[PDB]
């Protein structure tokens, strides 16, 4: 799905998330939780967070934000050759956590907003282009393993 010009544009932008990995996932997650309250109920450790301040105050959210981007960060450094790190997440999020594919759509959009907000001006038409594609290739590979186990379709 993507070339190196494009991969190279994805990793430069990732370069940005890594200087503040915990600030970028707290915000990503906040943005998911307030945008789609429904997703917050899946978590028995953050279901208690009614407000956005109880959320931003939360030291447990930021520790969960890190895991999220550390695990995502690693798939993308693979440049679509993620068959290995991905199998386990698809199979965890599907049989165990039972998260439908569109919640993965919510997070992706969520990531792309967050990148705008925090870098208001240094994430362009092309980077934005290439970051969408990779998050798309990502969802698609999972959809493919989500279809094998027959989790909703
Ligand atoms: C996982 N979030």
Swiss-Prot record:
Residue ranges annotated for the Globin domain, each copy included: 1-147
Molecular function (Gene Ontology), one example: heme binding
Binding-site residues for heme b, renumbered to this chain: 93
BP terms from Gene Ontology: oxygen transport; removal of superoxide radicals
SUPFAM superfamilies: Globin-like (SSF46458)
EC code: 1.7.-.-, 1.11.1.-
Annotated disulfide bonds: none
Gene Ontology cellular-component terms listed: sarcoplasm
Cited function: Monomeric heme protein which primary function is to store oxygen and facilitate its diffusion within muscle tissues. Reversibly binds oxygen through a pentacoordinated heme iron and enables its timely and efficient release as needed during periods of heightened demand. Depending on the oxidative conditions of tissues and cells, and in addition to its ability to bind oxygen, it also has a nitrite reductase activity whereby it regulates the production of bioactive nitric oxide.
The protein, known as: Myoglobin
Gene expressing this chain: MB
């Amino acid at each position: 799905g993507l070339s190196d010009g494009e991969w190279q544009q994805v990793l430069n932008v990732w370069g940005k998330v890594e200087a503040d990995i915990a600030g970028h996932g707290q915000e990503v997650l906040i943005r998911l939780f307030t945008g789609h309250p429904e997703t917050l109920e899946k978590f028995d450790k953050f279901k208690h967070l009614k407000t956005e301040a109880e959320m931003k105050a939360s030291e447990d959210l930021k520790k969960h934000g890190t895991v999220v981007l550390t695990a995502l960060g690693g798939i993308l450094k693979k440049k679509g050759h993620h068959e290995a790190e991905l199998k386990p997440l698809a199979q965890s999020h599907a049989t165990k956590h039972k998260i439908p594919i569109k919640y993965l759509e919510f997070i992706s959009d969520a990531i792309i907003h967050v990148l705008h907000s925090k870098h208001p001006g240094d994430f362009g038409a092309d980077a934005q282009g290439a970051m969408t594609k990779a998050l798309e290739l990502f969802r698609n590979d999972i959809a493919a393993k989500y279809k094998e186990l027959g989790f909703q379709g």
